[PDB]
Structure formats: C-alpha cells, structure tokens
Amino acid sequence: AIVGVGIDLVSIPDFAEQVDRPGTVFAETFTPGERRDAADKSSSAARHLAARWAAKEAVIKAWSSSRFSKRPALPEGIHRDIEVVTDMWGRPKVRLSGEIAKHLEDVTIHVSLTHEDQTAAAVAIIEEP
Amino acid sequence: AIVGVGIDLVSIPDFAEQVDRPGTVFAETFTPGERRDAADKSSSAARHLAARWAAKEAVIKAWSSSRFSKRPALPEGIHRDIEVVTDMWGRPKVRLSGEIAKHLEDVTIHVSLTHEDQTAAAVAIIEEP
Amino acid sequence: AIVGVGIDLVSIPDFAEQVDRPGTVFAETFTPGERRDAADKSSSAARHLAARWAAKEAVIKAWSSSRFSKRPALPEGIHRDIEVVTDMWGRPKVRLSGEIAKHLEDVTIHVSLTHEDQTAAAVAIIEEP
C-alpha cells in the first residue's frame, strides 16, 4: 500500500536567491556551476533546478511522513542519500544511497515534477506491495 | 486500493481576506484568534492557516470524488467532521468526527501540505486495503 | 498498484495567450468558441479551461512515466485519445478513446484539479489491481 506522500511548492525567485549560498545541503545536491547558473532567476537553469529541488523535497517529506522516520528531525545524510535527477527528456529519476537506500530496498518511490512562471512543484508517493 | 484523490491550491492573500469574515465553516475550522491573526496576509499565521485550509479542502475533494459521497452537494457537518491540524513540526494530521468518522473507519487518509510566497497547496489520497 | 503519477502546474495568463493559436492539439481538446473565450485571461473560461488542461497534461505525464509508454516521444493521437472534461459541478472525468482506451482498459485513472488567482494545477494517478 501507500507508505508516504509528499507535495512541495518552490518559489523560483526565492530558490535562485538561496541556491548559490554556501552550504552542505545544496552542495550535496547540485554542482557549483549548476548553482551559479540557477542563481539567475530568469534562467532555464533556475526553473529546472527549482523543479528538481521541489521533487527532492517532496520525496523527503513523503519519507518523513512514513514509518521509516523514527525521529522528528531528519537523519544525518538524508540530503546526500536522496537525489532526484532528470534524463535528457526532463523526466525525474530517484537515486538512493547510504542508509536510505538500505532501508528502502523494498519500497517504490513515484515522483512527478512541474513548473511554470515563478513556481515549481512536485509530488512523491512511496509505496510497497 | 485508492478510494479518492484531491489537490487544492489556495491564494494566501485571498484566504487572508476571507478567513476572518463571520461564517460557520471557518468558525468550525479555526478559532477567532487564529482567524484575526491570519487576516494579515503577510503574517506567518496567514501562510500556515492557508496550508491547513488547502489540506482540509483537498481531503474533502478526495471524499467528494469517492463512493462515500452519495449526492453532488456536500453533506451537513462535513466541515465540522473533517479537520486537519499540524503538530509542532508543521506535519499534518487528519481528525475525523461525526458521521464521516463512522463511515471512514476502515479507510486511510494520506495528506501533505506546502506553501511558498503567495500560494499554499495540499494533496490528499484516501486509500483502503 | 500505482502505474504512473503526474502533476502539472499551468499559468492561467500564459495559457490564455496560447490556447487560441491555431494548432491540432488544442483543436482536439477544446472548441473554437471555448478557446476564444479562454483567450481572455481574466475570464472564468480561462480559469476553468486552464484547470482542464492541467488535468489532461497530468494524465499524459502519468502515462508517459508508465510502462505503457514505449518511446520517449508521445505517440500519435494521444491528445485526441485522452480528454478530461468536467460535469456541471466542476468535477473532472477522464475519457479515453483510440489506442489509449484499448491499452488502458484494465487500469484506473484518478484525477483532481484546482485553481486560484493566476495558477491552475492537477494531479493524476494511474493504478491497477
């Protein structure tokens, strides 16, 4: 059945203002070059990276809502252990590593992302047989 | 399987303008003090109450889309019988009462909420084994 | 289990600017009269048609994410074969035809739509026993 659900809305202008400020979470998510590019709120980079961020946040929220989260505070490494990339067609793919990959070996994570104008959004559904 | 699905988008400024106007639905949802606070569109209260409203609306829409809804018009008491609160971590919890609680005793309601800038959103999925 | 998931966000002003430009996809979706009406971004027609579009796009994205999509590029006819209408209560209904109807005879498509201010959104979940 369904294990967790998450939805996330991201302001593309707010994201652009934050994404290239030094810090481990964003450095663990995007490259310095990606972050420089996305700091321009009018850019394709800003729009597309904002949707990837929305997707990652939606997955983490779905995980935080699930039985797999034992404490209110997110576990160390979760932003390294959960990544959402897009193929050359814009379609999202979830990649897990570390402890998250270990614990979620037997669940599926569905994700969809979207954006328009100044807003990006994503939904994630974690599910098991 | 899935029983119903709902998504809701809420304008935080529009919400702030409506939330403190006298009426049973909002009075059944939030306290007078909460509604006064949220009438200021720039306030944290407005943003957070708007997301709770989006969540409640998303649950009601999921319910209205389901076999549990017998008529087009919502049943008396549904805004009293369905509430969405957040714990001190911002995580949503669904509380049912009245006839709704009775009829939905054997289904699960998943909900997620989010907000940024002038927009709040939520998704709800009702599901049964 | 879940077969595919899609979320779509639509700018109502951008939609209004595009919807009445001649082209097969929109002509296969809405009538000339509907499209003329919706070209006025301030109109009820624009808001409601934008949400129907968001819903159709969300279904197509859920389909594109599923095993039913064999190639990256959408198949011929998919915009004719997938339609989302609303009843007189604003509630969405999915209608399939052509090859899509044939291949999806044994799956369910859940859809929800919403709008406020300048934004419409929808989510779709395809599911099978």
How would you sum up the global shape of chain A? globular
Sheet with most strands: strand arrangement of chain A: 1-5-4
* Structural class assignment of chain A: alpha+beta
Taken together, the total number of domains of chain A comes to: 1
- Assembly state: homotrimer
Q: How far from one another are the termini of chain A?
A: 6 Å
Give the largest interface: A-B, 23 and 20 residues
Calculate Rg of chain A over CA atoms.
14 Å
Account of the 3D structure:
- Chains A, B, C: Belongs to the P-Pant transferase superfamily. AcpS family.
- The structure is a homotrimer of 129-residue chains.
- Chain A has 129 residues and is an alpha+beta fold.
- Chain A has one domain: Ribosomal Protein L22, Chain A (Alpha-Beta Complex).
- In chain A, 39% of the residues lie in helices and 29% in strands.
- Chain A has helices at 12-19, 24-27, 32-38, 44-64, 78-81, 98-103; strands at residues 2-11, 82-86, 92-96, 108-116, 119-127.
- In chain A, strands 1-5-4 form a three-stranded antiparallel sheet.
- In chain A, a hairpin with a 5-residue loop joins strand 2 and strand 3.
- Chain A starts with a strand and ends with a strand.
- In chain A, 44% of the residues are buried.
- The A-B interface holds A 1-2, 4-11, 13-14, 58, 61-62, 64-65, 72, 118-119, 121, 123, 125 and B 7, 89, 91, 108, 110-117, 119-123, 125, 127, 129.
